[PDB]
Coordinates of C-alpha atoms in Angstrom, one line a residue:
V72 CA 106.9 121.7 108.1
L73 CA 109.5 119.2 107.0
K74 CA 109.0 115.9 108.6
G75 CA 107.9 115.4 104.7
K76 CA 106.2 116.7 102.0
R77 CA 105.5 115.3 98.8
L78 CA 108.4 113.9 97.2
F79 CA 109.2 111.8 93.7
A80 CA 109.4 108.4 93.8
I81 CA 111.0 105.9 91.4
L82 CA 109.1 102.3 91.3
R83 CA 110.6 99.6 89.7
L84 CA 110.0 96.1 89.7
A85 CA 112.7 93.5 91.3
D86 CA 113.2 92.2 88.1
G87 CA 114.2 95.8 86.3
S88 CA 110.9 96.1 85.0
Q89 CA 108.5 98.9 86.3
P90 CA 105.6 99.8 88.0
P91 CA 104.4 101.9 85.2
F92 CA 101.8 104.5 84.3
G93 CA 99.0 104.4 86.8
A94 CA 101.2 102.4 88.9
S95 CA 98.7 103.2 92.5
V96 CA 101.0 102.8 95.2
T97 CA 99.2 102.5 98.2
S98 CA 99.8 101.0 101.5
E99 CA 97.2 97.9 102.4
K100 CA 96.3 100.4 105.1
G101 CA 95.8 102.7 101.7
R102 CA 98.5 104.9 102.2
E103 CA 98.8 106.7 99.0
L104 CA 101.8 107.6 98.1
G105 CA 100.2 108.2 94.5
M106 CA 101.1 106.8 91.2
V107 CA 102.9 106.6 87.9
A108 CA 102.4 109.7 85.9
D109 CA 105.2 108.5 83.1
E110 CA 107.8 105.7 82.9
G111 CA 107.6 104.0 86.5
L112 CA 107.8 107.7 87.8
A113 CA 105.3 108.3 90.9
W114 CA 104.6 111.7 92.4
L115 CA 103.7 110.4 95.5
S116 CA 103.5 112.9 98.6
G117 CA 105.4 111.9 101.7
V118 CA 106.2 108.6 101.6
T119 CA 106.8 107.0 105.2
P120 CA 110.3 105.5 105.9
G121 CA 109.5 101.4 106.9
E122 CA 106.3 100.8 105.4
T123 CA 104.7 98.2 102.8
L124 CA 103.0 100.3 99.5
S125 CA 101.1 98.2 97.5
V126 CA 101.1 99.1 93.6
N127 CA 98.3 98.8 90.8
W128 CA 97.8 99.0 87.7
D129 CA 97.1 97.2 84.0
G130 CA 97.5 94.1 85.9
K131 CA 96.8 95.6 89.2
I132 CA 98.3 95.4 92.2
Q133 CA 101.4 93.5 91.2
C134 CA 103.7 94.4 93.1
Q135 CA 104.4 95.9 96.1
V136 CA 106.8 98.6 97.5
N137 CA 109.3 98.0 100.2
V138 CA 109.5 101.8 101.8
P139 CA 113.0 101.7 103.8
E140 CA 114.1 103.9 106.6
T141 CA 115.7 105.9 103.7
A142 CA 112.7 108.2 102.9
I143 CA 112.6 111.7 101.9
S144 CA 110.8 115.1 100.9
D145 CA 110.3 116.6 98.4
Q146 CA 113.2 114.2 97.0
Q147 CA 114.0 111.3 94.7
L148 CA 113.9 108.0 95.9
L149 CA 113.9 104.9 93.7
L150 CA 111.9 101.9 95.0
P151 CA 111.6 98.2 95.2
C152 CA 108.2 96.8 93.2
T153 CA 108.4 93.4 94.6
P154 CA 106.1 90.8 92.9
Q155 CA 103.6 88.9 95.5
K156 CA 104.7 85.6 93.9

């Protein structure tokens, strides 16, 4: 039961901004880890270490998240929401 679970991700624009409330984080395969539901905190559910999330909100899929191998279960992990441009 502990490879992972569902987790608390902190998604942030590389600028210091936010994929903010409603930031749909789902990899380009549809690895739907979650969506921000306050500031820039998305209650994710099992992010795989080594992925490329896709983060969508008001401006939609604008940044994507680079998931490093330091991903973890049932804990907080802030992640790089890097713009496509």
